[PDB]
Amino acid sequence: VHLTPEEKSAVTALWGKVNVDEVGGEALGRLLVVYPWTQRFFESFGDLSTPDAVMGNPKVKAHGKKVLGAFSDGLAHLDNLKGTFATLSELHCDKLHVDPENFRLLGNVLVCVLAHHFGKEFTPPVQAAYQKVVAGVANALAHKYH
Amino acid sequence: VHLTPEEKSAVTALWGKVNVDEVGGEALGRLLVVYPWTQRFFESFGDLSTPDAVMGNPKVKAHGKKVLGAFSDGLAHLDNLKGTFATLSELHCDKLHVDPENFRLLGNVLVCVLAHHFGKEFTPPVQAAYQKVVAGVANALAHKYH
Amino acid sequence: VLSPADKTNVKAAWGKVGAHAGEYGAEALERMFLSFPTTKTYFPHFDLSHGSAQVKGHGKKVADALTNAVAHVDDMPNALSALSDLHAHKLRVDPVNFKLLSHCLLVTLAAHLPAEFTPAVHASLDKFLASVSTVLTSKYR
Amino acid sequence: VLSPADKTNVKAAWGKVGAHAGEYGAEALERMFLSFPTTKTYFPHFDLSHGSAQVKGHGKKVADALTNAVAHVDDMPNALSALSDLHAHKLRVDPVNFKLLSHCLLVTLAAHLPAEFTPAVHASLDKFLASVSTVLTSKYR
Ligand code: HEM
Ligand code: HEM
Ligand code: HEM
Ligand code: HEM
Ligand SMILES: O=N[O-]
Ligand SMILES: O=N[O-]
Ligand SMILES: O=N[O-]
Ligand SMILES: O=N[O-]
Numbered sequence: 001v002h003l004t005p006e007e008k009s010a011v012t013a014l015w016g017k018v019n020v021d022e023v024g025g026e027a028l029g030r031l032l033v034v035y036p037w038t039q040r041f042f043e044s045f046g047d048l049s050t051p052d053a054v055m056g057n058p059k060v061k062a063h064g065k066k067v068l069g070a071f072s073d074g075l076a077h078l079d080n081l082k083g084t085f086a087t088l089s090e091l092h093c094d095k096l097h098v099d100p101e102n103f104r105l106l107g108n109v110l111v112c113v114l115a116h117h118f119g120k121e122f123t124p125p126v127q128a129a130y131q132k133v134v135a136g137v138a139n140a141l142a143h144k145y146h
Numbered sequence: 147v148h149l150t151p152e153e154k155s156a157v158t159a160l161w162g163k164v165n166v167d168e169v170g171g172e173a174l175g176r177l178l179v180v181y182p183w184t185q186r187f188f189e190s191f192g193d194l195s196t197p198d199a200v201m202g203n204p205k206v207k208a209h210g211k212k213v214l215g216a217f218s219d220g221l222a223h224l225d226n227l228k229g230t231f232a233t234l235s236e237l238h239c240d241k242l243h244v245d246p247e248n249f250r251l252l253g254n255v256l257v258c259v260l261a262h263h264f265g266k267e268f269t270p271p272v273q274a275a276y277q278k279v280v281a282g283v284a285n286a287l288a289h290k291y292h
Numbered sequence: 293v294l295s296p297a298d299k300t301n302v303k304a305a306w307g308k309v310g311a312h313a314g315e316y317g318a319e320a321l322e323r324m325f326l327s328f329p330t331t332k333t334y335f336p337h338f339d340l341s342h343g344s345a346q347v348k349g350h351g352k353k354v355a356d357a358l359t360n361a362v363a364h365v366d367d368m369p370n371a372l373s374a375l376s377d378l379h380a381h382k383l384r385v386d387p388v389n390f391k392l393l394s395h396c397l398l399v400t401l402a403a404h405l406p407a408e409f410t411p412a413v414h415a416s417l418d419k420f421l422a423s424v425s426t427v428l429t430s431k432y433r
Numbered sequence: 434v435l436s437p438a439d440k441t442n443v444k445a446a447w448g449k450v451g452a453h454a455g456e457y458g459a460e461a462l463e464r465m466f467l468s469f470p471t472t473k474t475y476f477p478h479f480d481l482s483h484g485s486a487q488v489k490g491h492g493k494k495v496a497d498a499l500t501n502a503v504a505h506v507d508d509m510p511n512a513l514s515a516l517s518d519l520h521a522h523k524l525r526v527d528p529v530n531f532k533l534l535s536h537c538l539l540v541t542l543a544a545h546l547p548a549e550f551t552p553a554v555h556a557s558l559d560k561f562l563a564s565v566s567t568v569l570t571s572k573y574r
Pocket of ligand 6: 213252
């Protein structure tokens, strides 16, 4: 996806302030709570019975860490998301069969977490730039279906 | 998109029997009747007040002809849909701003028209092959959004 | 909101389908599994091959649910409440998958109703299946 | 189907938003137009630039509709019937666009409710906006 330099500026400046041990788990937990069908792919994680159970589940935090690592990865390679996400696409599409609509959903949940954490700093143009990013990631992760 | 030779066989054998002066207008008319928000982009076509008005509207038939021409085009170039659809993508995305969900919808309506016209001949595997095709077209037409 | 015209159209198509509804449900399921292979993961314990007794029996159950819906069209949330619970809470069916099955049900009807599947009736059937889908995703949880 | 917990959560978030609801509606519209530029074609006669009086006034109308919905949460189809008609019949609003505005409304709340926007409340708000969206797309036609 092509971000303008202003869009790139908005995205990278914010991301440098993200707590990379926490934000991934927050986005994953919210994905499981808000869109509870997604709990289908995470039965082994244990107690997912309440929001509190999900958000405090250590497996959710640990796995979210890996997910954010992959977003961090795409951010370093915006002009080659397809290459960056090839093996994850193989995994999410060929092996797991996750519907790619859920990739868009996780991206939007991430956006919500970023807004919650950054407040007024997550301005309408900053969001716009992030929307281009998470759409780019979702599309690359979905490449094995295309 | 990669069709197997069996999938290619299913698709091309059927398409050679399609009435290319009619099927495009049938798919477009049904798109306008079933998903009536799409009539937003076709105000100049005149009377769209009833199903009968839509299906007998000469502008609908004439424009559907051009649409099917483009599907015919993608069918000749399955391994390069992106190149085939570049200028249409520019048009549908940059100039018209059609949400790309409607590309998927038109593809599914086409599938319904094919089933209606071919009956038992439009078998479950034949459909599967066509689904890969219309998804490939929708994705290429949506490239300007990616 | 299904119109009086929609209700008559769906009733007409139901009538024409008649005693084939079970067989057609089975066909729609096969079309779905082949066209949209992600859907298969919901039936890990089914054999999904052509002519499978499990797909046949399930086709009948689905067709029967849709006919219960037609027969109680003005009270669908209530008629389908047990099924809504099942599909959201136990099965965790992703909402996108309702559009995929709905499309495959339409395709099956189109393949078997040359006279009945007009643009108007196609519309009404789409609205009907969208209404059923809305009920069956109303529960998440 | 909105739960008792959902209804209390949405009420709590409404309360905290308070008299900022109009301003927040305006912000959500700006977020939508910048993030999802296809949506702009519905407002060809608006000036969509930052600080536009038309976007401000519209933000208030949207916020007011949502609060009417909250206040009549158990009778939303009826409360929003005139708006459902408008959005489907006259405006021909594509159903996808309701998800885009809903997402932008959530983002705006998240940006302004550090304490209120918990995972549970985020869930409830999502369900609320999805319910509103379902009502407002119930009409096509
Ligand atoms: C927003 C896009 C997504 C990204 C960037 C992402 C990223 C990742 C990463 C980095 C892993 C670790 C792979 C490894 O261990 O080598 C993973 C695994 C996994 N993902 Fe995702 N994911 C996304 C969306 C989703 C969604 C929406 C679901 C289900 C609703 C899902 C289901 C899974 C599951 C079940 C695993 C465990 C795979 C295994 O260990 O066998 N993913 N993902
Ligand atoms: C299924 C994918 C689609 C294909 C293959 C397709 C194909 C075409 C073609 C071949 C043209 C003629 C362009 C020309 O005259 O050079 C066209 C024009 C047009 N399309 Fe589509 N189309 C698709 C989807 C859609 C949808 C879903 C909508 C709206 C709901 C739409 C709206 C339009 C409009 C308004 C024009 C007239 C453009 C103009 O003359 O300015 N298209 N399309
Ligand atoms: C038009 C929409 C649908 C209808 C009318 C429908 C109807 C039904 C019925 C009648 C049953 C059996 C009820 C019982 O015996 O308790 C069932 C079960 C089930 N459904 Fe659906 N359903 C629909 C959509 C879906 C979708 C989209 C999926 C997933 C792709 C799905 C997956 C399942 C599964 C996995 C079962 C359990 C099957 C078993 O273990 O035997 N359903 N459905
Ligand atoms: C949460 C969902 C929504 C709510 C609560 C809402 C509410 C409203 C209200 C209260 C009005 C003015 C009613 C009147 O004065 O008669 C309106 C009008 C309008 N809406 Fe929405 N709406 C929603 C979704 C959408 C979406 C998704 C779009 C398109 C992207 C849209 C496009 C429009 C347009 C173009 C008008 C006419 C504006 C004008 O000409 O001044 N609405 N809406
Ligand atoms: O977000 N699960 O990889
Ligand atoms: O299908 N309209 O190009
Ligand atoms: O096949 N749907 O249960
Ligand atoms: O801004 N929705 O009317």
